[PDB]
Design a protein around this motif. Structure first.
Motif, PDB file in Angstrom:
ATOM      1  N   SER B   1       0.854  -1.207   0.000  1.00 22.33           N
ATOM      2  CA  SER B   1       0.000   0.000   0.000  1.00 22.33           C
ATOM      3  C   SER B   1       0.878   1.240   0.000  1.00 22.33           C
ATOM      4  O   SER B   1       2.068   1.128   0.160  1.00 22.33           O
ATOM      5  N   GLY B   2       0.263   2.387  -0.183  1.00 23.24           N
ATOM      6  CA  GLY B   2       1.038   3.619  -0.298  1.00 23.24           C
ATOM      7  C   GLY B   2       1.066   4.048  -1.742  1.00 23.24           C
ATOM      8  O   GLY B   2       1.013   3.210  -2.623  1.00 23.24           O
ATOM      9  N   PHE B   3       1.097   5.347  -1.942  1.00 25.21           N
ATOM     10  CA  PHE B   3       1.181   5.967  -3.277  1.00 25.21           C
ATOM     11  C   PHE B   3       1.979   7.254  -3.151  1.00 25.21           C
ATOM     12  O   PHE B   3       1.578   8.122  -2.388  1.00 25.21           O
ATOM     13  N   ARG B   4       3.049   7.357  -3.929  1.00 22.72           N
ATOM     14  CA  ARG B   4       3.982   8.499  -3.893  1.00 22.72           C
ATOM     15  C   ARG B   4       4.314   8.925  -5.317  1.00 22.72           C
ATOM     16  O   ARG B   4       4.256   8.090  -6.172  1.00 22.72           O
ATOM     17  N   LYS B   5       4.719  10.175  -5.515  1.00 20.77           N
ATOM     18  CA  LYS B   5       5.206  10.568  -6.852  1.00 20.77           C
ATOM     19  C   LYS B   5       6.560   9.868  -6.944  1.00 20.77           C
ATOM     20  O   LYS B   5       7.473  10.273  -6.254  1.00 20.77           O
ATOM     21  N   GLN B 299       2.987   1.247  -9.903  1.00 15.75           N
ATOM     22  CA  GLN B 299       3.089   1.471  -8.437  1.00 15.75           C
ATOM     23  C   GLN B 299       2.094   0.614  -7.641  1.00 15.75           C
ATOM     24  O   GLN B 299       2.380   0.326  -6.476  1.00 15.75           O
ATOM     25  N   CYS B 300       0.937   0.253  -8.194  1.00 17.15           N
ATOM     26  CA  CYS B 300      -0.131  -0.445  -7.429  1.00 17.15           C
ATOM     27  C   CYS B 300      -0.219  -1.923  -7.828  1.00 17.15           C
ATOM     28  O   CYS B 300      -1.036  -2.632  -7.207  1.00 17.15           O
TER      29      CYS B 300
END
Ligand SMILES: *CC(=O)N(c1ccc(-n2cccc2)cc1)[C@@H](C(=O)N[C@@H](C)c1ccccc1)c1cccnc1
Ligand SMILES: *CC(=O)N(c1ccc(-n2cccc2)cc1)[C@@H](C(=O)N[C@@H](C)c1ccccc1)c1cccnc1
Lengths: 302, 302
Positions: B1-5, B299-300
């Motif tokens: 989990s987590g989302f970053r540029k 990313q996911c």
């Protein structure tokens, strides 16, 4: 002009990332000199996650039990040990790409670049900060563990973080490269909760200082204030106390903007009490606290 | 989990960054094979910025007029030319660190990592998107020019952007590596304005799709809607029209979340019409449009 969450160039760390294996379990390791470093949880099975005895388990394994792979190549494990929550796997071969490095335990509020790695292949880079509750709000997927955080000191890579686990919060826990956890987290499958996440006050001011330097100056008020006055309001909204160190560390930005520290604080106090009214600062509709004063100086000076 | 540029690892591009010089003028170049590429504005003086004749100027210079420096070393310029707004400086030596590369002209809405370089030394990495007005909202300081944008295609580095100038808006204009500007911008010191910046609609939906996958699902409404219905509301708030391609490109995320594209659109319509009420999505108090569907999948998914 411009302000972005910026990472260090990851080049000197790409060349240190290896694949480490046990049975159904592959994670990332970090090959520096003739040592490879990874999370000791690579020795565990799904049966022994609820309460594993790592000592006992390591007894069951030997040098040849561990498949260290560098891209297309394999390394000979000529010795293993356990340093707190990390495996130090000794190898025949020294990394020819080993940059000058240090191992630093970073302090909460401080920031570092993460090189997110799957199967020993670097996948991506982002900037992250140790939160005061000693979690990180990462971007990791299954297989991410052993991925490292670092700063680059001129030519010297400083390793500060190794990724070990995701909390049910969806936030991330890890160690320094001596294998001690940041915070109270343990590497077992038990109920663990991240405490109250508080805002990093010096960082928010850093960022307001970045904003001013970028010409975004609307939030600036005619007022000023005191430390005590400011820190009373701070506490109310889960914010770190501002200290005279914090004040001193903001001198270069104070000095560049012409704006006293305590007048920036007064602007923050009004921003905290009134919110932002749909107004934005540096393209954000909320107060950013994942840049330090250094990050701000580096990006806004050179 | 987590989302970053998240940026691509910059390692294969660090080894291509050189210092290029003329008199009081040093900027960055890109050494691929036996060619070094930089902005042709390195030949100009402060007198000839208002309206420079680049052809005429290049006539005044010769191979030996240009100081190409690789770290501590110097390269012999065995030939120069001009391709649109770039200097192609031919050199005795081929870069031994030249990764497999391509030159692609990227499309507005598409994203790329930037390796921000001063004096041929890589300083930092961040993710950026071509805005529809063909500007980028970079983080560049004086000396940044010749810094490149790229994507990494498995092992193949794609170069899409070379940095040439900052607009009075504080936003950034540059070329592809064949030296054609993104947008109507010219490399002279004249009045140039970035047109209306419009939101990238597929990217915002990508990001809502990232949000859902991260468990942030509050904004989801009981409603749905139509393309035409959605695109009427879109136009009103400076948003790109959504097309059937855009819909098709979101299938994998539709497919992973269980949520139809058009129901996500209905959620966006209500978010546009009502704002976010101080509520956040993926740690942002506003709608993010600098991730594509690919960036979100990468990313996911992994
Ligand atoms: C490496 C990895 O990606 N994860 C992980 C799996 C297993 C263990 N482990 C501890 C003792 C034996 C095995 C640690 C980490 C997953 C992950 O951490 N999932 C969480 C919910 C978890 C599971 C089991 C124990 C502890 C934590 C992962 C997923 C996303 C980001 N990082 C890690
Ligand atoms: C390389 C550089 O950092 N900048 C820059 C300087 C000079 C020129 N130039 C065009 C024709 C002759 C010389 C281009 C770029 C500055 C910069 O671009 N300043 C802007 C205001 C500008 C000045 C002069 C001409 C065109 C634009 C810079 C600053 C910040 C970020 N990128 C570039």
């Amino acid at each position: 002009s411009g302000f972005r969450k910026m990472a260090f160039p990851s080049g000197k760390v790409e060349g240190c990332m290896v694949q480490v294996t046990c049975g159904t379990t592959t994670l990332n390791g970090l090959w520096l000199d003739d040592v490879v470093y990874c999370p000791r949880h690579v020795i565990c099975t799904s049966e022994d996650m609820l309460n594993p005895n790592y000592e006992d388990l390591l007894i069951r394994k030997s040098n040849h039990n561990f498949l260290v792979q560098a891209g297309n190549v394999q390394l000979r494990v000529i010795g293993h040990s356990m340093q707190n929550c990390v495996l130090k796997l000794k190898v025949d071969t020294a990394n020819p790409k080993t940059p000058k490095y240090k191992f630093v335990r970073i302090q909460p509020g401080q920031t570092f670049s993460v090189l997110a790695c799957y199967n020993g292949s670097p996948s991506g880079v982002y900037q992250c900060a140790m939160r005061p509750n000693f979690t990180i709000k990462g971007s990791f997927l299954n297989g991410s563990c052993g991925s490292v955080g670092f700063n680059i000191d001129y030519d010297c890579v400083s390793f500060c973080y190794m990724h070990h686990m995701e909390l049910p919060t969806g936030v991330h826990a890890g160690t320094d490269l001596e294998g001690n956890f940041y915070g109270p987290f343990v590497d077992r499958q038990t109920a663990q909760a991240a405490g109250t996440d508080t805002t990093i006050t010096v960082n928010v001011l850093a960022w307001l200082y970045a904003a001013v330097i970028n010409g975004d100056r609307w939030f600036l008020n005619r007022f000023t204030t005191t430390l005590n006055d400011f820190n009373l309001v701070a506490m109310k909204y889960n914010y770190e106390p501002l200290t005279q160190d914090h004040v001193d560390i903001l001198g270069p930005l104070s000095a560049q903007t012409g704006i006293a520290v305590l007048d920036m604080c007064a602007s923050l106090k009004e921003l905290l009490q009134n919110g932002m009214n749909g107004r934005t600062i540096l393209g954000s509709a909320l107060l950013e606290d994942e840049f330090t004063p250094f990050d701000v100086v580096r990006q806004c000076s050179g």
